[PDB]
Amino acid sequence: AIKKAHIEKDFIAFCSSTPDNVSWRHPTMGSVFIGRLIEHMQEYACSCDVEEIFRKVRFSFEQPDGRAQMPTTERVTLTRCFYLFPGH
Amino acid sequence: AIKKAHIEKDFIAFCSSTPDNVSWRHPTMGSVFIGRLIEHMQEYACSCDVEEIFRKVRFSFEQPDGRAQMPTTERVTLTRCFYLFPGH
Amino acid sequence: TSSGSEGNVKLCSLEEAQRIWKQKSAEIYPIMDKSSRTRLALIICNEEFDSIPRRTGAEVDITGMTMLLQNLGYSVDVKKNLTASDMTTELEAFAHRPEHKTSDSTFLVFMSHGIREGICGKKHSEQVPDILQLNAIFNMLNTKNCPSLKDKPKVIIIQACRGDSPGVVWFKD
Amino acid sequence: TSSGSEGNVKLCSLEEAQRIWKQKSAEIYPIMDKSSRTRLALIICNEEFDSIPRRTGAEVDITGMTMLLQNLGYSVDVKKNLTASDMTTELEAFAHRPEHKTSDSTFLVFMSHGIREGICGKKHSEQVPDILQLNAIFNMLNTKNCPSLKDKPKVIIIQACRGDSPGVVWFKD
Ligand SMILES: *C(=O)[C@H](CC(=O)O)NC(=O)[C@H](CC)CCCCNC(=O)c1ccc(Nc2cnc3ccccc3n2)cc1
Ligand SMILES: *C(=O)[C@H](CC(=O)O)NC(=O)[C@H](CC)CCCCNC(=O)c1ccc(Nc2cnc3ccccc3n2)cc1
Numbered sequence A, B: 001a002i003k004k005a006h007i008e009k010d011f012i013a014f015c016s017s018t019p020d021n022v023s024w025r026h027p028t029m030g031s032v033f034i035g036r037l038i039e040h041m042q043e044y045a046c047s048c049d050v051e052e053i054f055r056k057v058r059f060s061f062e063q064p065d066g067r068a069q070m071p072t073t074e075r076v077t078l079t080r081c082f083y084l085f086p087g088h
Numbered sequence C, D: 001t002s003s004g005s006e007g008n009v010k011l012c013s014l015e016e017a018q019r020i021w022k023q024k025s026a027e028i029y030p031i032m033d034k035s036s037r038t039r040l041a042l043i044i045c046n047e048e049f050d051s052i053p054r055r056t057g058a059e060v061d062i063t064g065m066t067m068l069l070q071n072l073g074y075s076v077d078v079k080k081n082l083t084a085s086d087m088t089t090e091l092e093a094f095a096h097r098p099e100h101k102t103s104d105s106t107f108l109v110f111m112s113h114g115i116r117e118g119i120c121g122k123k124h125s126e127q128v129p130d131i132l133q134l135n136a137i138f139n140m141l142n143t144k145n146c147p148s149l150k151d152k153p154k155v156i157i158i159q160a161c162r163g164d165s166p167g168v169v170w171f172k173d
Helices: A032-044 A050-060 B032-044 B050-060 C014-023 C058-071 C084-095 C098-102 C134-141 D014-023 D058-071 D084-095 D098-102 D134-141
Strands: A002-006 A011-015 A072-074 B002-006 B011-015 B072-074 C040-045 C075-080 C106-111 C118-120 C154-159 C168-172 D040-045 D075-080 D106-111 D118-120 D154-159 D168-172
Touching (some): A032 D058, A032 D154, A050 B050, B011 B050, B011 C134, B032 B050, B032 C058, B032 C154, B050 B072, C040 C058, C058 C075, C084 C134, C106 C134, C118 C134, D040 D058, D058 D075, D058 D106, D084 D106, D084 D134, D118 D134, D134 D154
Parallel strands (some): B011 C154, C040 C106
Antiparallel strands (some): B002 D168, B011 B072
């Protein structure tokens, strides 16, 4: 027996900036989006789902400085909450 | 005094299907995505933020029938949870 | 009762509203006072087309979405059967509405035929495309072109095909 | 202590794990048993390019992301300085890995220069573009081309420019 499945499902993309716009990177400190994402994942993977975490990353960029960027979540087909349950 | 603001922020797009794919519509019952969205908004606007609601709409499409489609959330720059607080 | 302004939308009680505001700190979009706010929404729906099949049942969608957005406190503008150029003109006009200044959010609803590239205008054909891109919608409503909606949720809902494929693959259990 | 496998990632306690599983019904992605699962992740990072500026500091990103994904239980493959064609070949190979069958999820990380159209390969120039589109990444990892990851979260992270604009507008208070 054969069954139908959605061709595209359970995806989430997270980009460092909005379309048309630059993303910033420091020669010794690395990319700000990457560093920010690691920090937030380290902090919130235990209590928040990945979509929640990505929103928090976005919020941390809310107030623009001299090097503004706004990380964007794209093409989301997550039907459920993705909890990482670190330690398990 | 002038201040900088992100050019693109606080957006959420919700599409009826995934890229490349059809979205379904009944001649007397209307579009399934639209009908499903209304139902979920009526039910969950009181307790869930819009991003949560859209995920629930997606979940309702999880099991494919003869007319499968998967609603997609796109280009999200919501930095906060958007609660509708119906009645307020 | 559905006889109230919010119709069939389940109400958020004062206790529930206080609980949500307490559970999360400064991670919720601020809502303006009900007595003063001027919330705006726009529905663009194409049903009758020059060269592509009629979108029978679209009226059900218009009714449902209009009533829903009104229930949620939005004043709904409904525009029907527009070309991509006409949609652009309508969107630009929407972005210029003074009410957004005294609003906390907005909803945009597009309902039409669609292809991979975007949303079909009434004049669309394969020979001469009449398409509004999603990219254009975002640009027209961003901080540069719509400063009044700065920091405010802009929800875009699109009912349209995005191609001709059925969206499915087979698998065996 | 960060001396454990999860390093600096804050641990989810058994009480917290039970509370999350109780608060939400059947709206969480199932996690496979730790003893048997074979979680896979892939990082593609381009630092040195033929015709565009060197991505100094990329090594910090590689280190951080590799360690983070390992902390979260993923076996990380790291590939450096690839053309768009080479990225495609690597992605196709990743989608064919037998470990995905005994996995519950995957992470894909892309770090490079980028333009509006997509991610830059090592050979990219304005005259002869070398670009991998985000659309291609999704297609290569979907149910048709990667049946092993059916029903499983596929997280794609992209560090790249998406154009030349600063991403800001001015306003007065
Ligand atoms: C693509 O451009 C358009 C998008 C649009 O909104 O118009 N879509 C189409 O043209 C599709 C073809 C791919 C629709 C063509 C119309 C044919 N309709 C059907 O075959 C059909 C059959 C059965 C149902 N059933 C059904 C069951 N439950 C519900 C519940 C709520 C709403 C609708 C509904 N419909 C629908 C459609
Ligand atoms: C576009 O294709 C690339 C994307 C990439 O990831 O390489 N981006 C660039 O080429 C941009 C130019 C638009 C980066 C060029 C490098 C110049 N860097 C800076 O001017 C700069 C200056 C200061 C800082 N500060 C800073 C402060 N805090 C942190 C914390 C964490 C990480 C980094 C960081 N950096 C950064 C960059």
